[model samples]
Target: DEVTAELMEKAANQLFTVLGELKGGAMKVGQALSVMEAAIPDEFGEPYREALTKLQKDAPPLPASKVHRVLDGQLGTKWRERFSSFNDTPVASASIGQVHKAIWSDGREVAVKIQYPGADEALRADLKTMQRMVGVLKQLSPGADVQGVVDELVERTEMELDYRLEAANQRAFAKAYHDHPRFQVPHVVASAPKVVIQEWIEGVPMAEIIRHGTTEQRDLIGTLLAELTFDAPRRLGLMHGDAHPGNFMLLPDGRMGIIDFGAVAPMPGGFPIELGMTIRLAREKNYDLLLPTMEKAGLIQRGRQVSVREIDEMLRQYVEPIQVEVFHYTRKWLQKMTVSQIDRSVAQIRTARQMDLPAKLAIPMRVIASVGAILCQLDAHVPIKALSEELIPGFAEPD
Candidate 1:
C-alpha cells in the first residue's frame, strides 16, 4: 500500500520539529526547502510545505544576555555607547541570527543583527550530518546529483555566516539603489565579523501585504519584485540571491525596501546574454533554434540524443508567463504546472537526465524560481514580458 496522508503528516511533523529545534544549518535547509514549495507536487507536498514554512518562521532565539555578549564581543565592550537605546527582545529571529531594534547614537533607528555565539560550530556540524544524510538519499535516486546540491548549499551557507561579507553586499546595494525612486536598500551603519547594523526599515512586510493588501498593492509589489529580480544584475552586477517574503517590505513612501544580503550572486558582467536569448527563443516557440542554441551553450551534451519536443515540454511552463503580456500568478496555476511537469518528466526521464544546468546559472535560476514562487503566493498580476524586454539584455527582439 502507498503511504497515507496521515503518515506523511506525522513524518513531516517529526522532521520539521527536529529541524526547527536545531536552529542552524538544519533550519536554514528547512527554510530553503520552503521557498521551493511551489515546485513540490501538491498531493504529498501540502503537509511538508506547511511544516517547512513553519520552520522558516520558528527559530530558537538567543537570550538577552547572550545577545548582549555577542554585541560586546563584536562591537567592543563599549557597544552600548554607540547605541542610545537598544531593545532586549529581538524583532526577528532567523536560522543563524536574531535582529534587535535599536537607536544608534546618531539618533537613527537601526537594526542590530547578531549571529549566535556558536553558530559557526553548529552550522558546520549540521552540514556534516546533512552530507551523510544526502549520501544515503543519493543511493535511492541514482540519477539525481544530490551530492552537488548539498555541496552548493554548504558553500553558500558558509558565506552567509560571515556578517562582514553580508554587510559589504548590503553596502553595494545600498549605494546602487540609494535614493532610487522605486526601491530602498538600508544603509550599513557598522559591521563586525558576526554582527551588522543597518538603518531600520519600518513598513508592512511582504507577509502582511500578501495577507491583507488590496489588489492594487499586491500588483504594485509584484511588479517591483519582478523589476528588481531582472534589473539588479544589469544595474549593480549582483543578483539578490534570497527572494522570500521576509527580505522585502512595502514602505510608507510606496517604495519597496529590501534587506538580507548574505546570499548574493556576483554577476559582474551583468545577466548572461545567452540565458536571455534562450528565454526569448523559448517564449517565441522557436524550438528548432532553441535546441541548437542550448547545445551551443553546453546545456546539453553535444552528442546527446535529445528531442525538440522534449525540450519544449521541459521549458513550457517556465516560459508560459512571458508568453502573455500580463501573467496572473496564482497557487493553483503553479501547482498545476508543477504536476504536469512532474508527470512529463517521469514519462521522459531519459530526456530529463540528458539535460544539465550550467554551474554559473544555478544561483540565478534559483533566484528566479524563488521570485516566481513569491509572486504566486501574492497572487499578483504582472507584466512579465514587458519587464523582461526592458531589463534582460537579449530578451528583446533585434531592432
Candidate 2:
C-alpha cells in the first residue's frame, strides 16, 4: 500500500512538471480545474490542488533563442529595427505567449507580446488529448456533461491561439476606455499574425497589492473592477472575459489598468435584458413572471420543470450582493457561498447534467462571476446598488 501511494505521488509530480513545461492548452485547462476545484470532493482535490495552482503563476518560460525565433518569423528578420530597445527577458509569461518591455522607434515605451513557436499545433494536440480524457472528467464530475464543457474549452482555446483576434479585442477596449478617469487600457501600436505591440503601462501589479495593501486601496480596486465588468458591455459592446488580479495593474495615479484580452467577447447589443428582468422578478418573488422570461432566453427549456424554489435559491446567491445598497465582500461570505454552491451542485447533480449554457452568455457569466471572485480576494466593501444602477442600465431600476 505504501509503495502504491508513493508511485501515485511521483506520477502526479511528473504530471505537474509536464503541464507546466507545456505551457499551452494543458496549463490552461489546469488553471480552470483549479478554479473549479471547490466542486470536487476533498479526496479527489487534495492531491492536485497545489499542482494546478502552480500553473497560475509558475508556468515555465521558454529560452531566449526560442522566443527570438518566433518573433523573427512573425515580425520579420529585422523586427529589431522597429524597436529602439527591446528586452529579451520576458516581463510576463503565460500559456500561449510572453510580454517583453520595449521602446519603439518613436521612443514610446510598449509591451511586445510574442507567441511561442508551434503553439497552435501544441494546443490542437493538447485539446485532442483532453477530448480523449472525457471519461476521466466524468469520473471527476459524474453528473456533468463534461463533453459539452470540453467542446467549449477546445473552441475558445483555439481562438486564443490567434493573435489577430486578441489584437482586435484589445484595441476595442483601449479605444473605449481612452481618457477615462478610473480605468486604463493600453493602445495597440502594431500587430502581426503572432505578435502584438502595445503601449506599456507602469504600475504595481494588483496581485502584489492584494498581498500587502491598505483596506481603502483594496476597496478602490475592487470597486473599479466591478464597475468595468458591468460598464464595458453596454458602453463598449465588449465583455472582458478575464478579470483576474494577475492581468491588472494598480497605477500610482489611482487608476486600474487591464492587460489581457484573449478571452474578450463581443456583445453588440449588451447584456440580455432578460437577465436583469429575471433578477427583478425573483427579488419580488414573481416566479410567475420569471419562468417565462427564463424560457424565452433559452435558459429554461420546455421539457424542464424546475421548481420556483430552485430558481430562487440560485438567484439569492448572485443577487445578494447587488440587492444591498452597500455590500461588503468578505472571505467568510465567499467561502459560505462557494460551499453552498457545491451543495447545490451535488443536490441537483442530475439537473446540472441536463443544463447547457447559452454560448453567447458564457463569457458574460464567467466575467461577472470572476469579478465576485476577485472581490472576495480583496475583501472589498463597495456601493453595489449604486454601481449596478449607474453602469448596467436596468440592473437596479424599478420595473
Candidate 3:
C-alpha cells in the first residue's frame, strides 16, 4: 500500500540518467543536488547518490566547427588573429558552456569560454518542465518548499545564460582579490554576450583535492573557503553564489583559486546584519531574543505559535559548528543531523514548515549551507567561531 525505497531508488536512477544526457538546466539541477546530497536521507540508497555525482562533470561536447562559428560570431571573423594559438578542443565542459585553452595575441595564456548555441532557449524550456516535475514530487514530501526552490532556479536562468554578465562579475572579483595572499580570481580579458575570455589559471581542482588531499590541505582549503564566503560581500560588494567544488582550485602556491562567476548575488552592504545577529542569539541560547529577531527577519511569522524550545531544537545541530572555537565537519556529523531532521516527530515537522526563508537571504543561506556541506565532505576542522566573528558583522557584541 506504500511506496517502497526500492521503487524510489529506481525512479531516482532513471531521473538522473536522463538528466545527465540532457546537459542544460537538467544538469544544473543534478550538480546542485550533488553539492547538497548530505541532506538526502540514508534510505535513498547509494546508487542514487552515485548517479548524482556523475552529473557533476558529464556533458556532451560541441563539435569544433560549431565552436569556431561561435567564436567567429562573437569575436568577429578575424577572431583567430586575437589569439596567437587557439585550441578548438575544450579543456572543460559545464552545464551551459565549455572552456577552451588559448594564448592571447598579447602572449597571456587565456581561457575562451563559448556558450552553447541555443543554451538559453534550452535551459528555459527545461526549467519550465522541471517546475512541473517538482510540483509532482511536492506531493510526496509536503513539508519542504520544493516548488519554491525550482522557481528560484528558474528566476536565475537568464542571468546565468548571459556571458557578459558573468564576465563583469568575474572582473569585479578579480579586481577585489588581485594579488591577494590566500585567494586568486582570474582577470577577464574580453567578453561578449555569448562568450568570455579570461586569464588561464593553473591549480589542482578542489574536487580532486577532496578525493585525495591530506588533512592539512583539507583544513586550509576549508578555512579559506569560509573566509571567501564571508569576506567577499564586504570587500567586493558581491558574493559568489555558487559553492560546488569544481568551481574552486587549490593552487600549488597555497592560494585558493575561484572560478565560474555565472551565478552571483550583489550585496553592496555585505550580509544582512540581522542574519549575523540571529546566529549570535542562537549561539548564546538566547531564544527569548532569537525568536523575535527571526520573525523580524521574516524567518517566522510574528504571531506564530512556535516556541523557543521548538526553535532551539530546530537550530541546535546547525549552530553547533559556530558554538565552538574549533569544529570538525565530518560526514558522520552531517549524516547524524540529516537523519534526526528527516525522522522528526510530527510536531517538529510542523514547526519546521512554519519557518520561511526570506527572498533576500536565500542566496546567502544557500551559499553557507553549501560551504558547510563541502567542509563535511573534506572532513575539515576549522575555527568557525573565529572566522564568523572576524567576517560576519553582529556575530560578536559590540565593545
Candidate 4:
C-alpha cells in the first residue's frame, strides 16, 4: 500500500510520541530532525511538515508523580527540604527531562531540571539504534554525508546525557558573560548526575518578543543574538551548539538571557580564525587564498579543479551579509539561500557533492545554521561586520 500524506504525518508524530515517552536520545534526535528537515528536499519535507513543527517546539511532560519520584531518588527524600518551595508541575519540558520553578532553602529562585529515571540507559540504547538507521537517512538526502552527521549526533548525545557536563558548560558561560550589558547568563547553583539547579531568569521568551516587540526591540535583539553566538567561542573557547529561539529570552531589564547548555561545543583554540578570514578573502575576490583553505576544510575536494567563478557565486550568498557593516536578515532570504542551494545545478554543487566538512568545523556549521533559522524569524538589520571584527581575532585584518 502506498503511504498517504496524512498517514505519513501520523506515523511521524506517533514515532515522536513514543520517543518522548522514552525520554532520552530518541526524543533529542526527534527534535533535531524537526529543525534539520528544512535541509531536506521539498518532496519529503512537505508530507511531514506538521509533525516536524510540533517536534521543534512541543514536548509532553512526565507525570508529576514520576517527576517527584525521580527528584527524590536523585536529590534524596529530603530534596523538598533543600528547596524552600518547589512546584509540582513543570514550567517546561524537553527531550531528556522537565524543568520546575523552585526556591532554594536560602530563598533564591531557581530552575530545577530533573532527568527521567533510566535516561542514561535510554540514551545509550537510542544511540545504538541510530547507528543501524543510516540506510533510511539516505532516502532523505542521498547527496549529504548522513553517516558523519549521525556519528556527531551520537557523540554529542553521549556527552549531553550527563547533567554534570551541562552544568560545567553553563557555569563557564555564566562567568564569561557576567554582567554583560546586553546579555544574561544564569549562574549554576547546584548540580548532580541527574539534576541541575540554576538561577531562574524572568523574561519574555525570544519567540514571543519577536512576535510582539517594537521595531527597535526586534533589531536590537537580533544583533545581540549574532554577537552572543560569535563571541562565546572567541571569549571562552566554547560554542553554543543549539541556538534556537526557545533557548533565549528578552528580559524586562533589556538584556537577552540564554539557557540550555547540553549542546555546547569546545573550540579550545578560539573561533576558527581562518574560517572568518577566508570569508572576508572570498568576498574580496581572493580565490587563490580562499580556494586552498576551502579545499583544505573539505568544502571542496582536494586535488580537484573547480571553477572559481562558480565558487565565488555561492560564497557571495554567505559573504555578502558579513561584508557589510549592517545587514538585514529576511525569512525569504534565508529560505532562498539554504533551501535553494539544494536545488542548484551550478558548478559549486558539483564541487560540493564530493565535499566533506572537517570534523572540527562541522558543529560550528550547525550552530550557524540553527541560529540563522531563528534570526530569519526576527527579520531585523544586524551589525554583522562590527561584531566580527570585535569578537573574531584576525577577521578583517591585513594578511
- The lDDT values for all models are 0.78, 0.74, 0.78, 0.74
The lDDT, on a scale of 0 to 1, for candidate 4 is 0.74
Q: In model 4, where do residues sit more than 4 Å from their true spots?
A: 1-64, 118-160, 296-298, 338-349, 352-354
Clash pairs, model 2 backbone: none
* TM-score for each of the candidates: 0.77, 0.74, 0.76, 0.75
**Candidate 3 on 1-399: residue-level lDDT in tens?**
256888998899988767543533333455545533444444544544444443343347877888888888899989999999998789987667898999999999998888887676556655655565555445433343453567577667866677788788889999999999999999999989788899999888888779998998899898889899999998987989869998898998999999878768878778988888888898888878888888888777667677566666566655888878889999999887665434344444356333357756777888888988999998899998898898888887766
Highest TM-score model number: 1
Candidate 2 lDDT, tens digit per residue, 286-335? Answer: 87877877777766655565766557656675678877877898888877
Model 3 scores what on Cα lDDT? 0.78
Q: Across residues 13-97, which tens digit of lDDT does each residue of candidate 1 receive?
A: 9887675435433334455355334433456435434434432443478778888888889988898999999999999876578
Count of clashing pairs, candidate 4: 0
Clashes of 3: 0
**Which residue pairs overlap in candidate 1's backbone?**
none
After TM-score superposition, the amount by which residue 379's alpha carbon in candidate 1 deviates from its true location, in angstroms, is 0.6
User: Residue-wise lDDT of candidate 4 within 151-258, one digit each (tens)?
Assistant: 776767766677888899899999999989998999999988878899999887888867887777778788888888888887888898778778888888889898
User: TM-score: which is higher, 2 or 3?
Assistant: 3
